[PDB]
Design an enzyme around this catalytic site. Structure first.
Site, PDB file in Angstrom:
ATOM      1  N   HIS A 181       0.760  -1.117   0.146  1.00  0.00           N
ATOM      2  CA  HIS A 181      -0.037  -0.052  -0.043  1.00  0.00           C
ATOM      3  C   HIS A 181       0.893   1.140   0.001  1.00  0.00           C
ATOM      4  O   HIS A 181       0.277   2.385  -0.213  1.00  0.00           O
ATOM      5  CB  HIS A 181      -1.098   0.044   1.216  1.00  0.00           C
ATOM      6  CG  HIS A 181      -0.578   0.541   2.363  1.00  0.00           C
ATOM      7  ND1 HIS A 181       0.013  -0.419   3.282  1.00  0.00           N
ATOM      8  CD2 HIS A 181      -0.533   1.697   2.718  1.00  0.00           C
ATOM      9  CE1 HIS A 181      -0.021   0.243   4.359  1.00  0.00           C
ATOM     10  NE2 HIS A 181       0.077   1.452   3.922  1.00  0.00           N
ATOM     11  N   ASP A 220      -0.812  -7.107   2.350  1.00  0.00           N
ATOM     12  CA  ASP A 220      -0.053  -5.917   2.069  1.00  0.00           C
ATOM     13  C   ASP A 220       1.390  -6.077   1.931  1.00  0.00           C
ATOM     14  O   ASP A 220       2.186  -5.906   3.105  1.00  0.00           O
ATOM     15  CB  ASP A 220      -0.559  -5.227   3.032  1.00  0.00           C
ATOM     16  CG  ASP A 220      -0.257  -3.560   2.858  1.00  0.00           C
ATOM     17  OD1 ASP A 220       0.157  -3.292   1.623  1.00  0.00           O
ATOM     18  OD2 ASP A 220      -0.102  -2.816   3.923  1.00  0.00           O
ATOM     19  N   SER A 264       4.520   3.128   8.201  1.00  0.00           N
ATOM     20  CA  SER A 264       4.128   1.821   7.328  1.00  0.00           C
ATOM     21  C   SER A 264       5.061   1.452   6.445  1.00  0.00           C
ATOM     22  O   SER A 264       5.755   2.206   5.917  1.00  0.00           O
ATOM     23  CB  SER A 264       2.675   2.364   6.583  1.00  0.00           C
ATOM     24  OG  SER A 264       1.730   2.679   7.630  1.00  0.00           O
TER      25      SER A 264
END
Ligand code: NAG
EC number: 3.4.21.5
Lengths: 36, 253, 11
Positions: B43, B99, B199
């Protein structure tokens, strides 16, 4: 490079390789109850 | 990282910064798993809902860093990307299941005191360490608070893996076997979490058996940062290891 | 804000 890669992975030059511990890794090890 | 502390120099030598060429900004964290492969969250690269779709020419990976904003001359190494591989079943439409993405560097990076790869877990290491209550470590240059608030150097925080039932009951999102959650509970008196900017970074654990650091997760998603009753979600690296090994075996070298 | 990096890496 995919698990069975880099015979030297995960050993830090400034810590494990010199046998020095970082400021908080003991907290991790103390949490692994029923391993050692 | 919220409620973390300054990392020591060389503490996470596999930490990688995903850096946007123009404008020049921090995109996400990532990790070095060999001299030419970097692991991150899909992502961070591809997310249609926000018109995000970066190609190898839009980014740079900076390795061996400590300071968030300086060009750390003679210490960090900046590499260009040769190819980006996103998991074919990455579910961006619903819950960010799978992910994960691999990035092949144009040229191998040389290791040093500040640049060194982390290990990927094998079945038994995952079985033995991925248990509720056991703590792992997250690092990154992400925001210090949910609504800044940016650190001057790499931040670190140790967090306990949470029982699956508790992870599921904290969100309305459908959780899968390819994710696990981590963080302190409202009544534990300690807090901390990843936040925007963190992230794609690594969730690592140190094996008490062979003293090596293993990357068990990838910072994937969360609802806010460090909110009570909520937890950060991580991509389960071992469950996706076959895909990883497959990409490296086919496109390696 | 970020310090500029060498041009080499931007070409
Ligand atoms: C992202 O861009 C690539 C080409 O650069 C394209 O093939 C792909 O369809 C795009 N991703 C989307 C919008 O699903």
């Amino acid at each position: 490079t995919f698990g069975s890669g880099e015979a030297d992975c995960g050993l830090r030059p400034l810590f494990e390789k010199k046998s020095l511990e970082d400021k908080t890794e003991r907290e991790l090890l103390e949490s692994y109850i029923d391993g050692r | 990282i919220v409620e973390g502390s300054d990392a020591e120099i060389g503490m996470s030598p596999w930490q990688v910064m995903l850096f946007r060429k123009s404008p020049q900004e921090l995109l996400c964290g990532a990790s070095l798993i060999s001299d030419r492969w970097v692991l991150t969250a899909a992502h961070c690269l591809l997310y249609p809902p926000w018109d995000k779709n970066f190609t190898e020419n839009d980014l740079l990976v900076r390795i061996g860093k400590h300071s968030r904003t300086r060009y750390e001359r003679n210490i960090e190494k900046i590499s260009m990307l040769e190819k980006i591989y996103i998991h074919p079943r990455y579910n961006w439409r619903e819950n960010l299941d799978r992910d994960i993405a691999l990035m092949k560097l144009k040229k191998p990076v040389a290791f040093s005191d500040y640049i060194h790869p982390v290990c990927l877990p094998d079945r038994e290491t995952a079985a033995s360490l991925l248990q509720a209550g056991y703590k792992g470590r997250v690092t990154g240059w992400g925001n210090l608070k949910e609504t800044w608030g940016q650190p001057s150097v790499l931040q670190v925080v140790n967090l306990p893996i949470v029982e699956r039932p508790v992870c599921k009951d904290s969100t309305r999102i459908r959780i899968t076997d390819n994710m696990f959650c981590a963080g302190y509970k409202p009544d534990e008196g300690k807090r901390g979490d990843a936040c925007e900017g963190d992230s794609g970074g690594p969730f690592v654990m140190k094996s008490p058996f062979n003293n090596r650091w293993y990357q068990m997760g990838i910072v994937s998603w969360g609802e806010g940062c460090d909110r009570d009753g909520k937890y950060g979600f991580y991509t389960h690296v071992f469950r996706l290891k076959k895909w990883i090994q497959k990409v490296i075996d086919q496109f390696g070298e | 804000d970020f310090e500029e990096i060498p041009e080499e890496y931007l070409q």
